Amino acid sequence: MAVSKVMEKILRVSNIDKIFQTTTQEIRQLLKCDRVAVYRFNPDWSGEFVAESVGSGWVKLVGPDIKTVWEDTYLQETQGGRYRHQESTVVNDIYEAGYFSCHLEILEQFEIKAYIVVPVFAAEKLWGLLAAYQNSGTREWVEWESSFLTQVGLQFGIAISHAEYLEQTRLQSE
């Protein structure tokens, strides 16, 4: 077996897209929520949704023909917000959160009423965000839900780190 292929097998990251897809579904089922999504930052701290599980009837953000970019002004200004410092955000009702109109408009376009978002770190860098969304109504999230999502964020982060590691072994022999 080829070195890079044995590694891939040891680090458990054959096919990171399938990992994201199946895991977001499993989380969505556990949390009984309406969407679970993985969002990847661009160097300018804009970014896009790369994977999701989404319930019956809600707008889809990921797919063959779809591409959902969210350039968030606040996250761009701050280079990843509080998520840089490994903090999580828990919002039971977006209308009680004290947001600005233009941010609320984006949340409404995604049919979000309540959500959790946690960091996804790759190496020591903030790579993206993992979020769970309630679309049907407000929701009072509980600590086990947000601590678990945080724990999955760590899992996704390491998986991405393995993928970047393997990628960045670009053209060394052995």
Ligand X SMILES: */C=C/C1=C(C)C(=O)N/C1=C\C1=NC(=C\c2[nH]c(/C=C3\NC(=O)C(C=C)=C3C)c(C)c2CCC(=O)O)/C(CCC(=O)O)=C1C
Which listed residue (19, 62, 131, 149) binds ligand X by CB under 6 A? 131
CB of 123 to ligand X, least distance (A): 20
Q: Does 116 bind ligand X (CB under 6 A)?
A: no
Q: Residue 36 corresponds to which amino acid?
A: V
Size of the site for ligand X (CB under 6 A): 20
Which listed residue (20, 39, 127, 141) binds ligand X by CB under 6 A? 39
Q: Does 158 bind ligand X (CB under 6 A)?
A: no
Q: Does 77 bind ligand X (CB under 6 A)?
A: no
Q: Does 91 bind ligand X (CB under 6 A)?
A: yes
Q: Does 61 bind ligand X (CB under 6 A)?
A: no
d(CA 129, CA 120): 5
Nearer to ligand X, 19 or 37 (CB): 37
CB of 162 to ligand X, least distance (A): 22
CB of 103 to ligand X, least distance (A): 3
SS3 for the chain is CCHHHHHHHHCCCCCHHHHHHHHHHHHHHHHCCCEEEEEEECCCCCEEEEEEEECCCCCCCCCCCCCCECCCHHHHHHCCHHHHHCCCEEECCHHHCCCCHHHHHHHHHCCCCEEEEEEEEECCEEEEEEEEEECCCCCCCCHHHHHHHHHHHHHHHHHHHHHHHHHCCCCCCC
CB of 7 to ligand X, least distance (A): 30
Q: Does 102 bind ligand X (CB under 6 A)?
A: yes
